[PDB]
Amino acid sequence: GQFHDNANGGQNGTVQEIMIPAGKAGLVIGKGGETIKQLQERAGVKMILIQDGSQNTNVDKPLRIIGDPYKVQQACEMVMDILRE
Numbered sequence: 237g238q239f240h241d242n243a244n245g246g247q248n249g250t251v252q253e254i255m256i257p258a259g260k261a262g263l264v265i266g267k268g269g270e271t272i273k274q275l276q277e278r279a280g281v282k283m284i285l286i287q288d289g290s291q292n293t294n295v296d297k298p299l300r301i302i303g304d305p306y307k308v309q310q311a312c313e314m315v316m317d318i319l320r321e
Contacts, residue, residue, distance in 0.1 A: 241280055243306035252301035252312040256285070256319065261297045263318045279311040280304070 239248035256264050265285055266272050275283050281303040289298065299315070301308050 237282070237303070238280075239304050241304045241307060244304045246305060248304070249302060250305040250308045252299075252308050254297075254299040254301070254312065254316060254319070256297035256299055258295055258297075260319055261285075261287075263321075264297070264299065264315050275311065275315065279307045279314065281307050281311045283311065283315070 239250075244250075254264075264272065264275075265287065266274065272283060272285055275281075281301055284300045284302065286298040286300075287293070292298065301311050301315075303311075
C-alpha cells in the first residue's frame with residue numbers, strides 16, 4: 237500500500253465512496269469478480285466492494301476506493317464511467 241505512489245498530494249489515504257446500482261454492480265464486480273480483481277491491480281489501488289455486508293445487499297452497493305488521490309480519482313472515473321455506460 238504505497239499510497240504515495242505518484243501524486244499523493246495531501247492525504248495519503250484518499251477514500252472514494254460510490255453507490256453501485258443493484259444490478260449494474262455486475263459491471264463493477266466483473267460478472268463474478270474478475271473485473272474487481274483487475275481494477276485493484278491495474279490502478280494500484282484498493283476497491284472494497286461491500287457485496288457481503290448485507291442489509292443493502294438487495295440495493296445499491298457501498299464501494300470504497302482507498303489509496304492515492306490521483307489513482308483513486310482515475311479509478312473512480314474508471315468504474316463510474318462503466319456505471320454511466
